[PDB]
Amino acid sequence: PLKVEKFATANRGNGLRAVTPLRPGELLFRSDPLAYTVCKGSRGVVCDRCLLGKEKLMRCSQCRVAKYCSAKCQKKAWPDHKRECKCLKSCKPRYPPDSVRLLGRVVFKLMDGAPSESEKLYSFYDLESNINKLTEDRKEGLRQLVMTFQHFMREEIQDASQLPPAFDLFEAFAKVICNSFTICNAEMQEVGVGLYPSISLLNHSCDPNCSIVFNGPHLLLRAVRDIEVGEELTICYLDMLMTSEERRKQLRDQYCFECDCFRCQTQDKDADMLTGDEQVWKEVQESLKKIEELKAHWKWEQVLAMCQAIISSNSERLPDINIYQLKVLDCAMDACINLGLLEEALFYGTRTMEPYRIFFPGSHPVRGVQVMKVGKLQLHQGMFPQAMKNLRLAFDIMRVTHGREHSLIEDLILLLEECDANI
Numbered sequence: 001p002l003k004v005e006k007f008a009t010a011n012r013g014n015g016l017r018a019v020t021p022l023r024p025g026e027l028l029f030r031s032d033p034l035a036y037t038v039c040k041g042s043r044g045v046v047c048d049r050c051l052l053g054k055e056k057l058m059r060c061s062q063c064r065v066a067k068y069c070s071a072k073c074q075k076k077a078w079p080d081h082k083r084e085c086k087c088l089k090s091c092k093p094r095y096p097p098d099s100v101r102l103l104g105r106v107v108f109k110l111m112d113g114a115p116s117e118s119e120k121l122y123s124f125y126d127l128e129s130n131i132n133k134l135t136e137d138r139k140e141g142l143r144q145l146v147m148t149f150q151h152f153m154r155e156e157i158q159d160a161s162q163l164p165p166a167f168d169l170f171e172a173f174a175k176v177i178c179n180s181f182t183i184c185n186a187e188m189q190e191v192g193v194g195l196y197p198s199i200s201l202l203n204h205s206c207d208p209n210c211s212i213v214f215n216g217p218h219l220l221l222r223a224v225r226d227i228e229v230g231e232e233l234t235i236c237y238l239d240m241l242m243t244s245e246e247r248r249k250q251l252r253d254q255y256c257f258e259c260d261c262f263r264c265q266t267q268d269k270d271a272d273m274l275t276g277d278e279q280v281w282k283e284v285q286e287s288l289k290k291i292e293e294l295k296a297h298w299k300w301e302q303v304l305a306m307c308q309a310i311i312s313s314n315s316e317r318l319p320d321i322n323i324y325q326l327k328v329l330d331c332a333m334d335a336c337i338n339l340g341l342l343e344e345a346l347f348y349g350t351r352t353m354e355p356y357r358i359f360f361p362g363s364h365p366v367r368g369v370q371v372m373k374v375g376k377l378q379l380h381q382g383m384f385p386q387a388m389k390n391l392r393l394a395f396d397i398m399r400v401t402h403g404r405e406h407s408l409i410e411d412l413i414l415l416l417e418e419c420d421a422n423i
């Protein structure tokens with residue numbers, strides 16, 4: 001019995017709205033992908049199937065493109081890789097765009113799969129394509145993707161009857177553009193892209209009453225606010241660490257609407273997150289493009305080197321609430337942890353905390369995970385009372401954002417127990 005339902009909104013397409021009133025932390029919907037794949041950066045770094053990291057993955061000897069956690073995980077993936085394998089074989093060496101791999105998976109799934117649980121509320125067919133709002137520049141890229149797709153699937157897809165009835169690839173890529181989910185791991189790094197057609201009913205709010213979490217490819221939708229009956233459910237499409245001007249551009253370019261929520265109307269927090277000297281945080285914003293790029297490929301030592309040159313720059317420095325400064329910190333903390341530099345990690349981590357509290361209000365899973373990592377590092381260097389309070393704050397957030405159904409909450413429980421026993 002669903003707590004949520006599909007409904008037609010006055011001015012934002014087809015919405016989700018609560019059938020029963022809801023409490024924060026309440027599980028509202030859960031779903032596996034209609035189709036999904038690994039992102040370009042994490043190819044060969046994570047298992048194609050469960051998206052988990054390992055030092056040595058196996059690989060498909062047919063393709064040699066997809067790689068795997070294990071025999072189990074390679075063989076379970078086979079039924080939805082097998083028509084895709086033939087395509088990237090003969091496309092050796094030219095790996096296709098993520099969106100092109102994703103659409104390939106959709107077409108296979110829609111041709112050869114039983115109807116998916118992912119289309120229960122809303123189907124791929126029903127997805128918004130925002131086509132009467134696309135700019136001529138966006139459309140040019142769309143047909144570039146169509147031809148990219150065509151070349152890419154040529155040995156598996158030749159004609160229209162190898163597709164769904166009246167399937168329009170140009171229309172499909174348009175849907176993909178404004179409905180794709182960036183799948184992130186437990187530690188909150190992007191490890192994939194996927195589609196979840198029922199979850200795509202949720203419209204954006206720059207201050208939402210719902211959130212979504214990824215547990216591998218599995219997505220859980222929870223309420224993060226009190227919700228009453230008939231109220232539309234919202235999620236933030238976007239990184240919390242953006243100014244309203246940055247949200248405006250991204251909402252225009254990717255999702256084709258203007259947002260006139262209260263936070264955009266008042267440039268809420270904009271001034272705070274651009275404190276410090278303009279020239280300085282623009283360099284750092286420029287540099288962050290490489291830094292975030294290196295991170296997308298898990299090149300951790302190269303990440304840390306760049307980050308230190310900013311955080312301990314001889315030249316002028318930025319306040320930690322500067323979002324681009326704050327972002328460097330996040331990248332540096334994650335780098336140290338995956339480099340085993342735990343003291344240096346905690347140091348960046350603890351600095352992020354008061355700014356994170358400000359920019360991730362209520363219960364946000366990015367915060368919960370950060371606070372747990374901070375508690376994790378304090379626990380280990382033996383700082384029990386501070387860690388236990390942090391692991392307790394982390395739990396207060398993640399109970400709302402992750403829940404029993406999410407496995408990371410089970411790990412957080414282990415950490416609470418151990419530190420509490422230590423005390």
Ligand SMILES: CCCOC(=O)N1CCN(C(=O)c2ccc3ccc(-c4ccc(C5(N)CC5)cc4)nc3c2)C[C@H]1C
Pocket residue numbers: 178179180181182183184185188189190199200212214235236237238239241327330331366
């Ligand atoms: C329906 C189509 C429109 O909806 C969407 O496209 N959505 C739904 C909302 N969704 C997020 O919830 C999202 C999902 C996965 C994440 C993974 C990592 C981090 C993340 C990790 C670290 C940081 C920082 N180091 C800066 C703090 C920031 C974010 N965020 C993530 C946030 C984005 C996208 C899936």
Ligand SMILES: C[S@@+](CC[C@H](N)C(=O)[O-])C[C@H]1O[C@@H](n2cnc3c(N)ncnc32)[C@H](O)[C@@H]1O
Pocket residue numbers: 011012013014015126127128130178179200201202203204205254255256257258259
């Ligand atoms: C993932 S979908 C949300 C479901 C969509 N309304 C539908 O009917 O299929 C993204 C699209 O919904 C619309 N949308 C989403 N959030 C919005 C908002 N806050 N205001 C106006 N339109 C919005 C935009 O057309 C956007 O491209």
Ligand SMILES: [Zn+2]
Pocket residue numbers: 060061062063064065066081085
């Ligand atoms: Zn293969």
Ligand SMILES: [Zn+2]
Pocket residue numbers: 047048049050051052068069070073
């Ligand atoms: Zn796996």
Ligand SMILES: [Zn+2]
Pocket residue numbers: 205206207259260261262263264265
């Ligand atoms: Zn807004």
